[PDB]
């Protein structure tokens, strides 16, 4: 039964981080007067976990943005290549956003290029699709939400060669259609482009 | 404004894990972007990262047990000093409403 008291508000541990905030500790361990044989104990508060403050911000690694919109599909010195069998090229852009304070840079290629045919504003033959899956209730949490499924006039893409050769090497590349065409089809229920149907949503809950 | 500062943001649960201390300001605790903060300790565990949209929650239970109903799910713009995609301040919720159908049997008793 040796009476134990408190030692120092003890020697400081160094701030364990070179950036931002960290947690040092000293506490006050029951070391200069140790309770022995299981008698009394050290009375008070032994807790010190201290917030050390380093005035240097930490590096943050930059994250990728979403992929942009596809550029118009043209070819150099070939007028307009719309509705023809002339393969062109198109581009898309991203943005490395958020890298500050000597952080790591974005890992990857920032540009995406593919070969394309230009189908922008070209008249095509079409066929009516079936009823799509029922959409969400719009507007949610507002006055009278309604569902929406639709049959749209899907264009029939022309049977062009799906690959193209390269001049420098014999290996071939993909071709992918791009554009907003004007599909031609017979009418269904008084519409030429898209016929939809709205049904209101039942038992709308509070948000 | 002094706010409780945590050491690790557990993603996909929204819970602030590993407590560092209290009373420190928001500008000092978020110097390390792997941290998280919690004001008033009643909720709203926000990470120190840039404001990005969190994951969508699971669907709420169907508002009726019979025929066509409706169910919600929310998403909270988590982050600090920035705006989410669409001129959206941090802390704003976004909901999605879908019609469900638990069963096709009604008044069984």
């Amino acid at each position: 039964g040796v009476a134990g008291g408190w030692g120092p508000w003890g020697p400081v541990s160094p701030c364990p981080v070179t950036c931002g905030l960290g947690q040092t500790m000293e506490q006050r361990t029951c070391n200069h007067p140790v309770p022995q044989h299981g008698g009394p104990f050290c009375a008070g508060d032994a807790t010190r976990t201290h917030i050390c403050n380093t005035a240097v911000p930490c590096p943050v690694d930059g994250e990728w943005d979403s992929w942009g919109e596809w550029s118009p599909c043209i070819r150099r010195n070939m007028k307009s290549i719309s509705c023809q069998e002339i393969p062109g090229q198109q581009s898309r852009g991203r943005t490395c956003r958020g890298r500050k304070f000597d952080g790591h840079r974005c890992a990857g290629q920032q540009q995406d290029i593919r070969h394309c045919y230009s189908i922008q504003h070209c008249p095509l033959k079409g066929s009516w699709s079936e009823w799509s899956t029922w959409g969400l209730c719009m507007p949610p949490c507002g006055p009278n939400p309604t569902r929406a499924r639709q049959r749209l006039c899907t264009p029939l893409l022309p049977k062009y060669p799906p690959t193209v050769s390269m001049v420098e090497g014999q290996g071939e590349k993909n071709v992918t259609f791009w554009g907003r065409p004007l599909p031609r089809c017979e009418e269904l229920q008084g519409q030429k482009l898209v016929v939809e149907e709205k049904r209101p949503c039942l038992h709308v809950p509070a948000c | 404004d002094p706010v409780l500062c945590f050491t690790q943001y557990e993603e996909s649960s929204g819970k602030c894990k590993g407590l560092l201390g209290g009373g420190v300001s928001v500008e000092d605790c978020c110097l390390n972007t792997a941290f998280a903060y919690q004001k008033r300790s009643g909720g709203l565990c926000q990470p120190c990262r840039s404001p990005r949209w969190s994951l969508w929650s699971t669907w709420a239970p169907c508002s009726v047990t019979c025929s066509e109903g409706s169910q919600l799910r929310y998403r909270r713009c988590v982050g600090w000093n920035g705006q989410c995609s669409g001129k959206v301040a941090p802390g704003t919720l976004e909901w999605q409403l879908q019609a469900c159908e638990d069963q096709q049997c009604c008044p069984e008793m």
Partner: nanobody
């Protein structure tokens, strides 16, 4: 930055005991949370025991729990791994590991600073 030196290995019979010690750099000791690893002949590196910067919160693997007891001496810049009831499957090169932890009560499993190691061989 920090350097680690291990000692305490040897040839112990089956059922015997062996106590390991790890000497680190003194100027950057309480910065790093430290633990013990091992690497048997023909296996990957295995987590054994970890200890926080306080010594209060401890963490062990499931293969050494109950038999092993990790302790931290914050005054002599050493950690100890009391290995009781040594089996022939404990024959490995025990590495002392040092890794930065922000809280004083957080144990880690990933560490960036490692040492040369010490040889422990258990025979039957």
């Amino acid at each position: 930055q920090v350097q680690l030196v291990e000692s305490g290995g040897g040839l112990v019979q089956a059922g015997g005991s062996l106590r390991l010690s790890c000497a680190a750099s003194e100027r950057t000791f309480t910065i790093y949370a430290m633990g013990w690893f091992r690497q048997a002949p023909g296996k990957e590196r295995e987590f054994v025991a970890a200890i926080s910067r306080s010594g209060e919160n401890t963490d062990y693997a499931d293969s050494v729990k109950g038999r092993f007891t990790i302790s931290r001496d914050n005054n002599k810049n050493t950690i100890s791994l009391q290995m009781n009831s040594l089996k022939p499957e404990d024959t490995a090169v025990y590495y002392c590991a040092a890794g930065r932890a922000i809280l004083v009560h957080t144990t880690k499993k990933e560490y960036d600073h490692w040492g040369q190691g010490t040889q422990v061989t258990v025979s039957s």
